[PDB]
Amino acid sequence: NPFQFYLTRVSGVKPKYNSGALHIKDILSPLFGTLVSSAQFNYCFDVDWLVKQYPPEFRKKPILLVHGDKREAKAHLHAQAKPYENISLCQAKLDIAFGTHHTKMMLLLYEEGLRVVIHTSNLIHADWHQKTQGIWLSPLYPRIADGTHKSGESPTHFKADLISYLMAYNAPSLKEWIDVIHKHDLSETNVYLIGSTPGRFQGSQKDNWGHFRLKKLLKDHASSMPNAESWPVVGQFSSVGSLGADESKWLCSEFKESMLTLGKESSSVPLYLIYPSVENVRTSLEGYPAGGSLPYSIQTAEKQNWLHSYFHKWSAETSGRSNAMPHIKTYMRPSPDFSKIAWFLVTSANLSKAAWGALEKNGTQLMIRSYELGVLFLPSAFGLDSFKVKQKFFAGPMATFPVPYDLPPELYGSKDRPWIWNIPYVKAPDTHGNMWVP
Ligand SMILES: O=C(O)c1ccc(Nc2c(-c3ccccc3)nc3ccccn23)cc1C(=O)O
C-alpha cells in the first residue's frame, strides 16, 4: 500500500484485527532501523514505560522529550527523566493562555537514514493498550551524500514544511533536528503536513497553520466536482472545546468553510461529527476509565447543547474496533454515498478553536493556542481523482484508502448522550463491573 496509515494494536480483539496494526515496540524495533537518536514529541509521558519500549540495545541512545509542561508539572517530568542520563527535555513555549503541546511525533535517526512518525497516542501504557489510535509512517529517508547539493524535497513540500514547523519552537534542541532533516532526502513523501503552532498569524503567514493551512491545500491541490455541495464533511475526535453559543460562531462559519473548500474558484453540505456516546464508553473494552481520555467537561457542554445534534456514535466494525474507544482524530470528505473520499486527514487536532485557530481582528488574523500536527492524504498526490473507501480495513486494489471506522456514521439515538467526563454514571455498570464517580 502507498498510504502507510496504521492503527495501533488493541489487546483483546481477534488476531485478524491486529495483523496490520503496530505497537510502539514494533515502531522502535531494530527491523525499522538501527537507532542513533530519537525525539519524542508528545503531551503526556510515562518515562519508565517509554524507555522499556525501546529495544534493550537502544535504551541508552539519546532521547529528546518535547513537551509543554510548566511549573510543578514540568518538575514532575524532569523528575521522571533524571534517572536516565541519555534523556534531554525541550519545553515548548506556550505564550498564549490555555494552549497545550498536543503534537505526537517521533523523529528516529538511524545509521541507515531517518524516519518520521506522526501519530495520535500519548506515551503511556493505556494509550497503546485498548484504544483506536492512528499512525503515519514515513519512508526510510536516505542521507544526502556529503558534497552533493540537492533539495531532498517532495512534491508535497513536506521537508520544508516540517522544518518550518520545528523552526516555530525557536528551540536549540530542535535546531539540531532541523540540521538532521536538512541532510536527508525526503523526496518520496506523498502526504502534506498540516500543523498548528501558537501565535497570531496575518498576511503571508495566515495560510501557514490550522484550518487556513488546510483550506490553502484544498484550494491548491484538490478539484471541485459537480454536486460538491452533496459531499459531506466528517470530523472525528476525542475532545471538544467551547465552540460558542450557536453553530454560526465558529463551527459552521469558518471551520466548516475551510473543510468544504475544493479547488480554486469561489452551505447545505452535511456535517457529521463522530464522538463516543456514554453507551459507547460504558460497553468499551476499558469501560468507563476510557472516558478519562475523552475530556469533555459538563461546564463546556451545557453552553453548547446545539452541538450534540451533530453527534454520531463510534462504530468501527470494519477494523474490529467498535469497543476500542477512539483517541485518533480524523477528518475527511466522502462522496454522498460514502464510497469515495476526496481527502483524508489524521491529526492530533480535536474539535476546538485552540487547535484549529479562530479568526480575530475583523477576519485578518488567525489565532492558534496549541501545537498540533497531522498529515493530509490528497488523491492528486497519488495520481488519482479520488480514493475508493476500503470495505474492510485489514483486507485486500491497493489504491483504496483504509478508513478505520464505519460509514455512514450512525446518529445518536434519542436516549444517547455525549460522553462527559466529570459527571457520574451510576445507572448501569461497565465491562469491568464498575460505575463512574468523578
Ligand atoms: O487528544 C485528546 O483527547 C487530549 C485532550 C486534552 C488534553 N489535555 C488536557 C487535559 C487533560 C488532563 C489530564 C488527562 C487528560 C486530559 N485537561 C485539559 C484542560 C484544558 C486544555 C487541555 N487539557 C490532552 C489530550 C491528548 O491526548 O493529547
Side-chain angles (χ1 to χ4, degrees), residues 273-342:
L273 303 180
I274 299 170
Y275 175 78
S277 70
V278 176
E279 184 71 353
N280 289 158
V281 173
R282 183 186 71 88
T283 61
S284 81
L285 292 169
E286 292 180 77
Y288 286 129
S293 306
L294 297 153
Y296 191 15
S297 77
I298 180 67
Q299 297 80 20
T300 303
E302 59 185 9
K303 313 163 322 213
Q304 53 189 33
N305 282 316
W306 60 266
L307 176 64
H308 308 142
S309 76
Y310 289 89
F311 277 17
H312 296 69
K313 312 178 203 181
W314 175 255
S315 181
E317 303 290 281
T318 178
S319 52
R321 275 163 172 75
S322 297
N323 306 103
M325 287 302 96
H327 190 264
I328 192 176
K329 300 84 163 137
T330 61
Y331 303 82
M332 68 177 160
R333 191 84 197 272
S335 66
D337 71 356
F338 297 90
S339 60
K340 306 183 293 282
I341 56 172

Side-chain angles (χ1 to χ4, degrees), residues 5-16:
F5 169 61
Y6 301 80
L7 301 180
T8 51
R9 186 187 74 198
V10 173
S11 300
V13 304
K14 287 173 175 188
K16 65 174 149 166

Side-chain angles (χ1 to χ4, degrees), residues 42-44 98-102 104 120 122 127 238-239 292-295 327 329 348 350 421:
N42 219 292
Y43 175 73
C44 202
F98 309 109
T100 72
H101 184 267
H102 204 265
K104 298 185 180 70
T120 65
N122 289 285
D127 266 40
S238 56
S239 187
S293 306
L294 297 153
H327 190 264
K329 300 84 163 137
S348 64
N350 279 307
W421 71 340

